[PDB]
């Protein structure tokens, strides 16, 4: 079992930035890839990038060269570095990872993400 929390977020203007965190406890060792989502308002949940345990990343077209995916073994943490924000970048951001050889998925809990002037 792997449980996630998020923190960071909040409001912030266009052009501003925001580092996004997304700790995990439990089974940590056996998580295999984490990613991160995002739900803005009336859509359904959009990917936005995926990092491995070796450090591989990858990236939705949406976000690629404004944000960054990273992780820290040690401290069982997976990053979301959200630069040159834009307003359609409001929404509520959820990480996920998946573990024991992928098939199985934890999800964070959500945290609202506000881009405005
Ligand atoms: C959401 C937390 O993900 P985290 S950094 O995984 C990112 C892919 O999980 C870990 C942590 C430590 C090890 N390890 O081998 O020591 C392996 C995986």
């Known amino acids: 079992e792997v449980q996630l929390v998020e923190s960071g977020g909040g409001l912030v203007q266009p052009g501003g930035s925001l580092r996004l965190s997304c700790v995990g406890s439990?089974?940590?060792?056996?998580?295999?890839?984490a990613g991160w989502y995002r739900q803005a308002p009336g859509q359904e949940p959009e990917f936005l990038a995926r990092i491995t345990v070796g450090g591989t990343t990858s990236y939705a077209d949406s976000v690629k060269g404004r944000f960054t995916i990273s992780r820290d073994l040690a401290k069982s943490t997976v990053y979301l570095q959200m630069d040159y924000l834009k307003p359609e970048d409001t929404a509520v951001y959820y990480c996920?990872?998946?573990?024991?050889?992928?098939?199985?998925?934890?999800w964070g809990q959500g945290t609202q993400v506000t881009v405005s002037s």
């Open positions: 996920n990872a998946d573990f024991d050889f992928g098939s199985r998925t934890a």
């Open positions: 439990g089974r940590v060792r056996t998580i295999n890839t």
